[PDB]
Coordinates of C-alpha atoms and ligand atoms in Angstrom, one line a residue:
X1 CA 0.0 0.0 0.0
X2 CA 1.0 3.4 -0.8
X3 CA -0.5 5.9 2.4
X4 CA -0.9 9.2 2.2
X5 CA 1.3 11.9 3.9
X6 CA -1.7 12.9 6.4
X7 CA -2.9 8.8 6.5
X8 CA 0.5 7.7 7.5
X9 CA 0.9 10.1 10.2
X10 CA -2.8 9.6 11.5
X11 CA -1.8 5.7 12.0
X12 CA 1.6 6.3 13.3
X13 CA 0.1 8.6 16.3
X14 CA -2.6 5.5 16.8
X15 CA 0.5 3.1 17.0
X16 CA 2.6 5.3 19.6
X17 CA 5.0 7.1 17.3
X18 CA 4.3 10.4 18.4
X19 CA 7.0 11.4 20.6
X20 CA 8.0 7.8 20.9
X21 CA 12.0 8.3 22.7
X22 CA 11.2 12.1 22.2
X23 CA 10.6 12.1 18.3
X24 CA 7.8 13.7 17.3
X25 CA 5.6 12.9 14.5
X26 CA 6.6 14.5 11.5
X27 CA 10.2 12.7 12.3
X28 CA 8.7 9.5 11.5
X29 CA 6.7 10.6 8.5
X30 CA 10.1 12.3 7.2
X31 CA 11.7 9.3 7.5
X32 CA 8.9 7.1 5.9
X33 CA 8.9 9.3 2.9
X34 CA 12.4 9.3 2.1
X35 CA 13.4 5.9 3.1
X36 CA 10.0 4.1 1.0
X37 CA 8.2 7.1 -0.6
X38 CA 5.2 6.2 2.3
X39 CA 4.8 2.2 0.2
X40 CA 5.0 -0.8 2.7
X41 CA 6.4 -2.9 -0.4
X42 CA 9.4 -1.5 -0.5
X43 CA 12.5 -3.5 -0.9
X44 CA 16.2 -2.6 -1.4
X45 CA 19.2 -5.2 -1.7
X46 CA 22.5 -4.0 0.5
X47 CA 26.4 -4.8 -0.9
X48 CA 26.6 -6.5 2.0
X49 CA 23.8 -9.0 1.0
X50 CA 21.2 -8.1 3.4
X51 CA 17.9 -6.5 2.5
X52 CA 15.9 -3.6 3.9
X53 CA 12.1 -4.0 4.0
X54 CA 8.8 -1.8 4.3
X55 CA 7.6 1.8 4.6
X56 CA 10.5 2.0 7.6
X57 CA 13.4 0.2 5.3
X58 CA 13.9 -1.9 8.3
X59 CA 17.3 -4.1 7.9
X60 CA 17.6 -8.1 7.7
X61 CA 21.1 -8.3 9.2
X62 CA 19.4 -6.9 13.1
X63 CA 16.0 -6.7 12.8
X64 CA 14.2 -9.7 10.7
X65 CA 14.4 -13.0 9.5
X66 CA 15.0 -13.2 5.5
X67 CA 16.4 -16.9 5.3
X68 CA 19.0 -15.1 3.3
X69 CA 21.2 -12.9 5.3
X70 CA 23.9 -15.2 6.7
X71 CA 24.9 -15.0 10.6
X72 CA 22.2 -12.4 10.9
X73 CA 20.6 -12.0 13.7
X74 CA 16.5 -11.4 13.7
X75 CA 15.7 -9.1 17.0
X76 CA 12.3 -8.0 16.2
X77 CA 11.2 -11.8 15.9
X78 CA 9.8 -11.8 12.9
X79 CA 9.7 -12.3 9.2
X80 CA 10.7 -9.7 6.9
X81 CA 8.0 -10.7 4.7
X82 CA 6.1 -9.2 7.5
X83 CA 7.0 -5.7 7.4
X84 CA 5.6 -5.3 3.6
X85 CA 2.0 -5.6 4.9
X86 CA -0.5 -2.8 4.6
X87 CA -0.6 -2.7 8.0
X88 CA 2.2 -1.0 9.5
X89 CA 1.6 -2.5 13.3
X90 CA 4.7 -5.3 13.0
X91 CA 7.1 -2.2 11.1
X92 CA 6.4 0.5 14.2
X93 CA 6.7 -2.4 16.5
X94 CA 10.0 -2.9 15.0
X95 CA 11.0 0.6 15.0
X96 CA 10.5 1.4 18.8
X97 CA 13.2 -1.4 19.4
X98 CA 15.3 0.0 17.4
X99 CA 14.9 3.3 18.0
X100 CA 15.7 2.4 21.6
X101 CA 18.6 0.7 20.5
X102 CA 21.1 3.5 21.3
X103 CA 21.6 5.7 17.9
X104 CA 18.0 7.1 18.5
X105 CA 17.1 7.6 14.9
X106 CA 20.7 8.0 13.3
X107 CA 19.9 4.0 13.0
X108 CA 17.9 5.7 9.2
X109 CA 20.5 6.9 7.0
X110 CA 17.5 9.0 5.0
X111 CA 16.8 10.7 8.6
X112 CA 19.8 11.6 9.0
X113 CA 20.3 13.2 5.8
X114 CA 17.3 14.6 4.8
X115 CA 15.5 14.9 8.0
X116 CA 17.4 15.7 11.1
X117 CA 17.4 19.2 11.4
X118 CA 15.1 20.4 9.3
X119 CA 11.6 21.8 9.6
X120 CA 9.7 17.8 10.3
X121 CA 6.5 19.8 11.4
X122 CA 5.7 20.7 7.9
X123 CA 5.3 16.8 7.5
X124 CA 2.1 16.7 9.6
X125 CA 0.7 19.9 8.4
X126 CA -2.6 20.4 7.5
X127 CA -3.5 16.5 8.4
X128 CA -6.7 16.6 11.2
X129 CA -4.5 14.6 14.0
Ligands
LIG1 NA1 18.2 -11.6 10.0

């Protein structure tokens, strides 16, 4: 599914985002649009032969289990298969842990270089939140 700017950030507040480790909203809808343009079926191959999946391009080397990333571990116990659903619960699940993890959210390379620092309220502007 490809969301909306305003949809996304409506169903990231109902899953917790908002100020989730003190990032606020339009820092997780920044992120979503530049790391998967806001579509859960978003896929991208790595050099280092892991893959990042969904609307959060969350990484199969930490995070989930591709059968295809060797020595990898799988910390949000899960598939990877299961972060390209249309529902976005399993991806924000997935996010708070690694959001927690230490890096905050220099763990998105997109965030960091097209988000942090900038104006990430105009991301939720307008929406009816
Ligand atoms: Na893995």
């Amino acid at each position: 599914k490809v969301f909306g700017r305003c949809e996304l950030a409506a169903a990231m507040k109902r899953h917790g985002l908002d100020n989730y480790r003190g990032y606020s909203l339009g820092n997780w809808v920044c992120a979503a649009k530049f790391e998967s343009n806001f579509n859960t079926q978003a896929t991208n191959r790595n050099t280092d032969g892991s893959t990042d999946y969904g609307i959060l391009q969350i990484n199969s080397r930490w995070w989930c289990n591709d059968g295809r990333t060797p020595g990898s571990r799988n910390l949000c116990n899960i598939p990877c298969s299961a972060l390209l659903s249309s529902d976005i619960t399993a991806s924000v699940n997935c996010a708070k842990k690694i959001v927690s993890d230490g890096n905050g959210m220099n763990a998105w390379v997109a965030w960091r270089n097209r988000c942090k620092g900038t104006d990430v309220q105009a991301w939720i502007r307008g929406c009816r939140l």
